[PDB]
Amino acid sequence: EKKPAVSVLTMFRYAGWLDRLYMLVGTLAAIIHGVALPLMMLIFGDMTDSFASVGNVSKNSTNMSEADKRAMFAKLEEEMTTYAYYYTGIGAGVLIVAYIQVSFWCLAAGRQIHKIRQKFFHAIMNQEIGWFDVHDVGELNTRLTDDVSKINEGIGDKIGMFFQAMATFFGGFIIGFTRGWKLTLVILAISPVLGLSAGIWAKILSSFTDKELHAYAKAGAVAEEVLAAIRTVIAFGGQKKELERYNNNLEEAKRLGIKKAITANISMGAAFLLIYASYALAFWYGTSLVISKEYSIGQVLTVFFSVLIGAFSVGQASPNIEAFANARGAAYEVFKIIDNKPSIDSFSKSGHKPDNIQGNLEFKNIHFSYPSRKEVQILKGLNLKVKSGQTVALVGNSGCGKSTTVQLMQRLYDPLDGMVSIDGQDIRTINVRYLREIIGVVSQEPVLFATTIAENIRYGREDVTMDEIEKAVKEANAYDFIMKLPHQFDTLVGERGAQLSGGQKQRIAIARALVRNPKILLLDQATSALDTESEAVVQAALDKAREGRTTIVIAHRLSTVRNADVIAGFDGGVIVEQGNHDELMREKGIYFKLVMTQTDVPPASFWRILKLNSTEWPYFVVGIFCAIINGGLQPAFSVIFSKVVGVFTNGGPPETQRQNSNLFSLLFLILGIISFITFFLQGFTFGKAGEILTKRLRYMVFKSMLRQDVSWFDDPKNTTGALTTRLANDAAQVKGATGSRLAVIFQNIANLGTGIIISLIYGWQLTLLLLAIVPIIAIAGVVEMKMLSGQALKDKKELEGSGKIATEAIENFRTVVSLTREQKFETMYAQSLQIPYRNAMKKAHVFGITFSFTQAMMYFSYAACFRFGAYLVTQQLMTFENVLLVFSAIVFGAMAVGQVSSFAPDYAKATVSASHIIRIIEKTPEIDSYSTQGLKPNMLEGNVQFSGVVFNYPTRPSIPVLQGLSLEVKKGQTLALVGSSGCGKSTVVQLLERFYDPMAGSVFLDGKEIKQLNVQWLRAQLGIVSQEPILFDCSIAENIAYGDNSRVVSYEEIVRAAKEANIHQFIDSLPDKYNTRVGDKGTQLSGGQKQRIAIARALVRQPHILLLDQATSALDTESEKVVQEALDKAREGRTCIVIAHRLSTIQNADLIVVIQNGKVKEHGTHQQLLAQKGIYFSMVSVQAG
Ligand SMILES: [Hg+2]
Ligand SMILES: [Hg+2]
Ligand SMILES: [Hg+2]
Ligand SMILES: [Hg+2]
Ligand SMILES: [Hg+2]
Ligand SMILES: [Hg+2]
Ligand SMILES: [Hg+2]
């Protein structure tokens, strides 16, 4: 894939003349900061030149014993004063400059973002309604804060950091050439091999990356299927059969993960070799040029570093480019919306605004097709008039085009052909806001906004008084119930507040329209979702609302329409018939046909996690030794680098300056080789140690997950997705807290430990300065990581309130356009952004300082060392070689632990990722399905008995469900459970399945308490038939055979089960009869046919109990009767408990139980409970209507 982007010059629109100034000044700062370090290398060379000019004089030949001390040392004391005044001068200039760099760029970005948010949100509120039809709203809402966040990255400080790095790239290669061009051109001849070597691996590391996500996608698809279907898994006890499927597809991503683990460390050691190799080749050649008195030692050390600084400056500007390019990419999708102009402008002020509107409506030859499918036409040549004050009712079948009428009259769409007119004037010639202000809509499903009732009404009109709210509420028949609410009119409604009934919400929606006082009223299926009781009060409110207004209603439920003035019957976008109720009933057309049919913070320890990888201890031993060696190469380099410069800066005969240097020069390749080996071995032992640990933990987890009982899967935290996540990536991230953490610690110890030792003996005074400053500079890098993340939470949390407003407006956009309150949410959006704006303008002031005080404390400490270290050479207390042997042992070694710790996986994220694993493993359930003990008798009777069971769902222990529920079920007969809502009938199936235990009471099977039986054997002789049957992506034969696990199951056994389920006849005509793959790829079976499979699945087990829980939850009229044939067949000679909602099934049952509030109110046969004239008699009386 390749996504488009914006031109550079476009993207920086919305940048006023002040914003254009900050970026320019911010650059000139960034340029200075970029060159600031090259000058430190240039001075560093001139520093060693002063030391080298005397380093060999005073040693070989002794002119005087103490009159020569002053001679050479008073020369250095005057030369080293300037080099020290120079070093502090940079850190002072950095402190100023580094502030300007970050401050001015983040400021110019902030002023632009604030304009973008408002310009982008207003752009969305201005779009057409056909525009919302095509686009996915979910991405759009995230696009308001994700793409906007993506632009903010690539126009803030990240540009300042780019011009800083490029000012070093040119600033570095400049001083290299101008102080000595031969040695640089050597290095620039090998660096293409390094830029080549780096890119080739990133192509192979991205190769072994994307090969991995599609490798676990096979396993993770099994994880997502099971943990969503866990109720069927536990019910049929396939908790070991799903483990093998998940495991057999789990070794692929292990062997593949090693090919990354090897290659990932080759790419390091290969590129790390080429550093040490390019080190020798530049030092071997750089030393040959000082022997001949062409260069000094200062010239080599400047040019060699200043190239590597300027060369490594590329890699420091790579992500800052990608952020700027990602910012252009995200800015394209945004700026498209701002510059997109609609034909139906809800903000324009063009058309007329006619007063004293009578409401004469007309439709003239309307042809319309929704923008999703132009090819199909909904309306074709539709003509219709509506006289002022009259009510017209539109009726028809499906695909008729009724709801289009409401949507064309608000002008949410423009008709292709024809003309919609109000009072003889075309609708397209009047102003849109005034049009929708003179119209009130009453949609099918009523919407309420997360505010008070008063604000919900004030969205009808912002300037309404509280007296007018009371009147409009009274007219809507909503007053008396509002006064019964706790906080009267200030009661908080919406998603956030108390839930109101459906009939109550729609009456509020009326009051919004009534406040507008419209001349036209539109009702789009206003009472479809409401029941018979709530509809009656609303119709009185609507009939009141219609008085003196022209009205068009999209009417279902035809009885409400009989008193209407005129009816219109639709067939294929055309009105076929029109007249009064009596006329169309007489016509015996379309309308007559319709009327007559009606009438997360756990604490895991480091030692616990490490024990998980204990079964591969030999891999850990090698990685420790190997980690020590690579940790030893860093202080080794400090010697070999110092021993080189020690030759030409302490004194020696030119007879030995060749073999010493060439030795030390080729000792870098020795370090370079050993680097390549230790990386090739670090990722071969700790690498496999991590990829084994992933596979073994994903198995242990998914094993332990299925062990858990149902109350665990009932939790809100343990959702099927959050468990697949926990099983997918969290299971693998543990390895960053086992062997990787030992590779770190042994490398950090072997480096900084042995580096501390050496520097202490070679110079005990200077180290106490540096090892006192290293803690200071390391802390500063941490506090920036803190305040960068602690501020990331603060700003991103202040923005959700702004985002809640937007989310409320996008998710209900069709509403707000009808209320014409686009401007309101715009202001509400802007008012919410006033807080993060004024906060972010001081954020740049902060991060300007924290960036300056980090860089300045480094350059000042660079001067505090080479000032104090110079004082140690003047007093003859240490050699300049020992300075570099101290400095490049502590500093370059203290930098090494960061380059290590920053390369390894996130240890904090790894430990918490591991603590979640251990809980999921070490958790044993109240009901161990994997257990083996239990009575498990040879008694095949089937006497069920509940005795006073008391149960509360542990997810909600406050509510009760069952209180003293007792009931028996004799062998072979049927028991039916019925009741109102929240009675507890479905709990019986789950307690006999033993998904949960009861708090008190007991459940017996064949006179034996089920808590003593084996759980698998209990569920074995129970045949569950769930409401919505879960079918797995597999063939018919395997899905049915899943019922009875651990059986040979041959061809002969399969067909008998499908026969008795009444699918054999339907199957035999299907393509490839019983081998037909079922799932998303294969044939889609109807809801009734799926249930017969779940019945067939239960029949193969041959259980002596059958639980039927709300089966037949569908309207498949033909397939319905087929299911009941199969259901009656299964119950004939088995103990049966039925969760009854259909009144036809229960009449022939042997016994019935009416439950209410966990108590049996009455029980008996059908005829007895009918003659009881109690609760059960009330239920049968309802169907007589
Ligand atoms: Hg910033
Ligand atoms: Hg319709
Ligand atoms: Hg290693
Ligand atoms: Hg130093
Ligand atoms: Hg119920
Ligand atoms: Hg399957
Ligand atoms: Hg039965």
User: DSSP assignment of 1011-1080, as one string?
Assistant: GGS-HHHHHHTEEEE-SS----SEEHHHHHHTSS-S----HHHHHHHHHHTT-HHHHHTSSSTTT-EESS
Residues after which a C–N gap over 2.5 Å breaks the chain: 599
Computed from CA positions of residues 235, 239, 245, 250, in that sequence, does the dihedral angle turn out positive or negative? positive
Q: Identity (one letter) of the amino acid at 445?
A: E
First to last CA, the chain: 61
Tell me whether residue 796 is annotated as binding. no
Residue 1046 CB-density burial (10 A; 0-12 exposed, 13-18 middle, 19+ buried): exposed
Residues 6+ apart with CB under 8 A from 923: 704, 708, 712
Q: What is the CATH number of domain 1-350+600-932?
A: 1.20.1560.10
- Which tokens is 600 given? 């997360």
CB 763 within 8 A of CB 648: no
Ligand nearest to the CA of residue 1035, numbered in listed order: 6
Ligand 5 centroid to Cα of residue 710, in Å, is 20
Tell me whether residue 979 is annotated as binding. yes
Question: What is the rounded distance in angstroms from the CA atom of residue 638 to the CA atom of residue 569?
Answer: 93
- In which residue are the tokens 């008729």 written? 400
Question: What is the rounded distance in angstroms from the CA atom of residue 349 to the CA atom of residue 343?
Answer: 13
Phi-psi region of 942 (alpha: psi -120 to 50; beta: other; left: phi over 0): left
Could you write out the DSSP letters of every residue in 873-927? HHTTSS-HHHHHHHHHHHHHHHHHHHHHHTTS--HHHHHHHHHHHHHHHHPPPSS
Question: What is the rounded distance in angstroms from the CA atom of residue 511 to the CA atom of residue 518?
Answer: 12
Helix axes 907-922, 720-728, angle to 10 degrees: 120
Tell me whether residue 403 is annotated as binding. yes
Question: What is the rounded distance in angstroms from the CA atom of residue 988 to the CA atom of residue 1163?
Answer: 16
- In which residue are the tokens 């030795």 written? 663
Helix, strand and coil percent figures for the chain, each rounded to 5? 65, 10, 25
Residue 196 CB-density burial (10 A; 0-12 exposed, 13-18 middle, 19+ buried): exposed
- Which tokens is 1131 given? 């119950």
How is residue 452 annotated by DSSP?
Answer: B
To 5 degrees, how large is the angle CA 1001–CA 1006–CA 1011?
Answer: 45
Tell me whether residue 401 is annotated as binding. yes
Ligand 5 centroid to Cα of residue 1013, in Å, is 28
Instruction: Please name the CATH architecture into which domain 933-1185 falls.
Output: 3-Layer(aba) Sandwich (3.40)
Ligand 2 centroid to Cα of residue 396, in Å, is 6
User: Cβ–Cβ contacts within 10 Å for residue 942, how many?
Assistant: 21
φ/ψ (deg, to 5) at 313: -65, -25
Could you write out the DSSP letters of every residue in 825-876? HHHHHHHHHHHHHHHHHHHHHHHHHHHHHHHHHHHHHHHHHHHHHHHHHHTT
Partnered with residue 844 across adjacent β-strands are none
CB 149 within 8 A of CB 117: no
The H helix count followed by the E strand count for the chain is 46, 22
φ/ψ (deg, to 5) at 553: -125, 130
The bridge status of strand 1135-1139 relative to strand 1105-1109 is parallel
Phi-psi region of 22 (alpha: psi -120 to 50; beta: other; left: phi over 0): alpha
Ligand 4 centroid to Cα of residue 869, in Å, is 6
To 5 degrees, how large is the angle CA 746–CA 752–CA 755?
Answer: 125
CB 280 within 8 A of CB 668: yes
Ligand 1 centroid to Cα of residue 337, in Å, is 26
User: Cβ–Cβ contacts within 10 Å for residue 1081, how many?
Assistant: 7
User: Cβ–Cβ contacts within 10 Å for residue 1034, how many?
Assistant: 15
What's the Cα-to-Cα distance from 843 to each of 148, 750, 836, 848, 934, rounded to whole Å? 18, 40, 10, 8, 66
Question: What is the rounded distance in angstroms from the CA atom of residue 736 to the CA atom of residue 693?
Answer: 11
- In which residue are the tokens 């049966």 written? 1136
φ/ψ (deg, to 5) at 301: -70, -25
- Which tokens is 1106 given? 């059958």
Question: What is the rounded distance in angstroms from the CA atom of residue 570 to the CA atom of residue 671?
Answer: 87
Resolution limit, Å: 3.3
CB 272 within 8 A of CB 676: yes
Element (H, E) at 680: helix 657-707
Partnered with residue 1136 across adjacent β-strands are 974, 1106
| Ion ligand 6 — residues with CB < 5 Å | 1032, 1034
Tell me whether residue 398 is annotated as binding. yes
In the CATH scheme, what is the homologous superfamily, with its name and number, of domain 351-599? P-loop containing nucleotide triphosphate hydrolases (3.40.50.300)
- Which tokens is 417 given? 């052909």
Could you write out the DSSP letters of every residue in 741-801? HHHHHHHHIIIIIHHHHHHHHH-HHHHHHHHHHHHHHHHHHHHHHHHHHHHHHHHHHHTHH
User: Cβ–Cβ contacts within 10 Å for residue 615, how many?
Assistant: 11
Method: X-ray
Ligand nearest to the CA of residue 944, numbered in listed order: 7
Sheet with 425-426, side-by-side order of all strands: 379-386, 361-368, 417-422, 425-426
Residue 1047 CB-density burial (10 A; 0-12 exposed, 13-18 middle, 19+ buried): exposed
Ligand 6 centroid to Cα of residue 1140, in Å, is 31
Question: What is the rounded distance in angstroms from the CA atom of residue 152 to the CA atom of residue 850?
Answer: 20
φ/ψ (deg, to 5) at 916: -65, -35
CB 307 within 8 A of CB 57: no
Question: What is the rounded distance in angstroms from the CA atom of residue 1035 to the CA atom of residue 1013?
Answer: 33
Residue 342 CB-density burial (10 A; 0-12 exposed, 13-18 middle, 19+ buried): middle
How is residue 7 annotated by DSSP?
Answer: -
What's the Cα-to-Cα distance from 852 to each of 90, 380, 849, 1095, rounded to whole Å? 12, 71, 5, 73
What's the Cα-to-Cα distance from 185 to each of 282, 304, 502, rounded to whole Å? 10, 11, 80
Radius of gyration of the chain (CA): 40
Element (H, E) at 579: strand 574-579
User: Cβ–Cβ contacts within 10 Å for residue 1095, how many?
Assistant: 28
Tell me whether residue 980 is annotated as binding. yes
Give the residue extent of every domain in the chain: 1-350+600-932, 351-599, 933-1185
Tell me whether residue 986 is annotated as binding. yes
- Which tokens is 18 given? 């002040």
The bridge status of strand 566-571 relative to strand 391-396 is parallel
How many Cα atoms are found within 13 Å in the side-chain-facing hemisphere of 720? 13
Partnered with residue 1156 across adjacent β-strands are 1159
φ/ψ (deg, to 5) at 159: -80, -40
Q: Give the closest residue to 163 by CA, choosing from 24, 267, 357.
A: 24
Ligand nearest to the CA of residue 973, numbered in listed order: 7
CB 451 within 8 A of CB 493: yes
CB 1033 within 8 A of CB 1078: yes
- Which tokens is 984 given? 């507890």
CB 635 within 8 A of CB 655: no
Partnered with residue 1023 across adjacent β-strands are 1106
Element (H, E) at 576: strand 574-579
- In which residue are the tokens 């990581």 written? 785
How is residue 997 annotated by DSSP?
Answer: -
Element (H, E) at 1096: helix 1087-1101
Question: What is the rounded distance in angstroms from the CA atom of residue 314 to the CA atom of residue 191?
Answer: 12
Ligand nearest to the CA of residue 867, numbered in listed order: 4
CB 157 within 8 A of CB 843: no
CB 997 within 8 A of CB 1009: no
| Ion ligand 1 — residues with CB < 5 Å | 106, 156-157
Tell me whether residue 402 is annotated as binding. yes
To 5 degrees, how large is the angle CA 884–CA 887–CA 892?
Answer: 115
Ligand nearest to the CA of residue 892, numbered in listed order: 4
Q: Give the closest residue to 453 by CA, choosing from 478, 424, 427, 426.
A: 478
Question: What is the rounded distance in angstroms from the CA atom of residue 447 to the CA atom of residue 441?
Answer: 11
Domains 1-350+600-932 and 933-1185 share a fold: no
Question: What is the rounded distance in angstroms from the CA atom of residue 69 to the CA atom of residue 76?
Answer: 11
Ligand 2 centroid to Cα of residue 434, in Å, is 29
Partnered with residue 1144 across adjacent β-strands are none
Ligand nearest to the CA of residue 238, numbered in listed order: 6
The bridge status of strand 1000-1005 relative to strand 944-951 is antiparallel
To 5 degrees, how large is the angle CA 114–CA 117–CA 120?
Answer: 140
- Which tokens is 160 given? 């300042």
Residue positions counted in the chain: 1185
- In which residue are the tokens 């994903």 written? 698
Residues 6+ apart with CB under 8 A from 678: 269, 626, 627, 629, 630, 633
